[PDB]
Amino acid sequence: HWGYGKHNGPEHWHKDFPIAKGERQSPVDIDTHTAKYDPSLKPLSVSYDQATSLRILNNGHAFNVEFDDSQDKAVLKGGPLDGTYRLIQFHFHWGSLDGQGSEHTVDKKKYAAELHLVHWNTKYGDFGKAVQQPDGLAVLGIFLKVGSAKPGLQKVVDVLDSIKTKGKSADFTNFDPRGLLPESLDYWTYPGSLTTPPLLECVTWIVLKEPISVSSEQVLKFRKLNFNGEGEPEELMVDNWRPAQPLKNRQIKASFK
Ligand SMILES: NS(=O)(=O)c1cccc(F)c1
Ligand SMILES: [Zn+2]
Numbered sequence: 001h002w003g004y005g006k007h008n009g010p011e012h013w014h015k016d017f018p019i020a021k022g023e024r025q026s027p028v029d030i031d032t033h034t035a036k037y038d039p040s041l042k043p044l045s046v047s048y049d050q051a052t053s054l055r056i057l058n059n060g061h062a063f064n065v066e067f068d069d070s071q072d073k074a075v076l077k078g079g080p081l082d083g084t085y086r087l088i089q090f091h092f093h094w095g096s097l098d099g100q101g102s103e104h105t106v107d108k109k110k111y112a113a114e115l116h117l118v119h120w121n122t123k124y125g126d127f128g129k130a131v132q133q134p135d136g137l138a139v140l141g142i143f144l145k146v147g148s149a150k151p152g153l154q155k156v157v158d159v160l161d162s163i164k165t166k167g168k169s170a171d172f173t174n175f176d177p178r179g180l181l182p183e184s185l186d187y188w189t190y191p192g193s194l195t196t197p198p199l200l201e202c203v204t205w206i207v208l209k210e211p212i213s214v215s216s217e218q219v220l221k222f223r224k225l226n227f228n229g230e231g232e233p234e235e236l237m238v239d240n241w242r243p244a245q246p247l248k249n250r251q252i253k254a255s256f257k
Contacts, residue, residue, distance in 0.1 A: 002197045003061070003227065005235075010242050017197045024201045025245040026192030027103035028252070035188055035252040043255070044185045044206065045078035046140075046178075051087065053175040056159055060166035060227055061196060062091040062240055065156065065175060069120070069127070074177065076119045076138055079206055079255070080189045085119035085138040088127055090177060092116070093195075094222045096238035098146045101219075103195050103241045104207050106143075111211060112219055113144035114241070115180060116195075131194070136202040142182065147213035152179020157221045166229040182210035186256040195242045209256065 002008050002016065014020035051074035055066050066089045067074055074087035094113035095101025102111035117140040120130035130136035144150075155175055162170040186209040193201045225237035 004240050013197055013199065017199045019193070019199045019201065022193070022199070022201055023248050024191050024193055024250065025199065026195050026203060026205060027105075027242060027244055028190065028192065028247050028250075029105045029108060029244040030188050030207065030252055032107050035254045037257045038253040038255070041080060041189070041253060041255045042078045044076065044140075044187060046076055046181070046185065048074045048087070048176070048178045050074065051175075051177055053172050053177075055169050056156070056163055056172040057169040058163040058166055058225060058237075060229075062093065062237070063160070063163060063225065064089040064091045065172055065177075072122070076117075076140060076206075079187065080204055080253070081138055082135070084122045086122055087117060087119050087177070090115060090117045090180070092144070092222065093241040094144075094219060094238065095241070096223065096236075098216075098219070100239070101241055102143055103244075104141055104143070104205075105244055111143040112146045113214070113222065115142040115144060115212075116140070117142070117177065117180075131198075131200050131202045133202055134191070135204060137194075138204045138206060141205060141207040142180065143208070143211035144214050144219070145211045146216055146219060149215035149218060150180070150212050152176070153214055153218055157218050160221055160225060164224070164230075165226045165232075168230070180212065182208060182212050184208070184210040186210065186254075188252050188254050190250050190252045192250075209254075
């Protein structure tokens with residue numbers, strides 16, 4: 001099955017997921033000079049004060065911190081969005097080296113990692129229904145650069161030893177995702193897709209302009225995770241990113257000039 005190796009990586013995905021060659025695939029390169037400032041774009045409204053984290057899971061492709069999405073506890077609204085999108089999980093994509101790891105790029109620049117806070121449109125009732133809709137998901141993407149530590153990331157880093165291998169999960173309650181945000185909520189936005197199979201074209205992407213900084217030790221700990229299950233040959237979970245895809249008939253909009 002699909003992964004990030006030479007034999008099952010992004011160049012192979014189209015054989016099982018033909019939408020890989022579709023009209024609104026993600027990620028993309030954000031060419032900052034050609035992105036269009038849209039003065040009609042509203043500020044983002046990130047309402048995470050009542051978030052209920054539940055668990056952290058290694059799914060063989062990344063690790064997901066999962067939330068209770070059975071009520072409007074942690075929601076995203078405003079920006080380019082109509083209606084209310086509920087936080088279901090966040091995860092990261094990262095590199096084997098500090099010079100790569102992000103999925104989106106900015107003027108071809110790669111960051112060390114990229115955080116995705118995944119939200120689904122509550123008019124569709126559940127996540128499974130939402131991914132079948134062109135406006136089903138909103139993913140808030142945040143770049144990570146290596147520099148100073150992100151204190152709000154440390155609780156995540158410290159639990160990774162308990163979910164080293166595929167299929168492992170751990171309780172992960174009372175985590176506050178507000179501690180993962182940068183200061184500014186300035187963003188770019190464009191219509192796209194899931195960046196992993198099934199590659200569904202259901203995502204309004206909202207990518208923050210300001211990266212967060214994490215420490216070398218924090219990202220090193222991501223790199224100690226495994227793609228494999230316990231007792232299978234060890235393969236480090238690194239370079240779990242899809243490269244930039246053609247923009248095709250899309251214009252990236254900016255909330256700022
Ligand atoms: N990487 S991502 O597009 O945020 C993504 C991929 C697959 C499932 C999902 F909920 C989110
Ligand atoms: Zn992702």
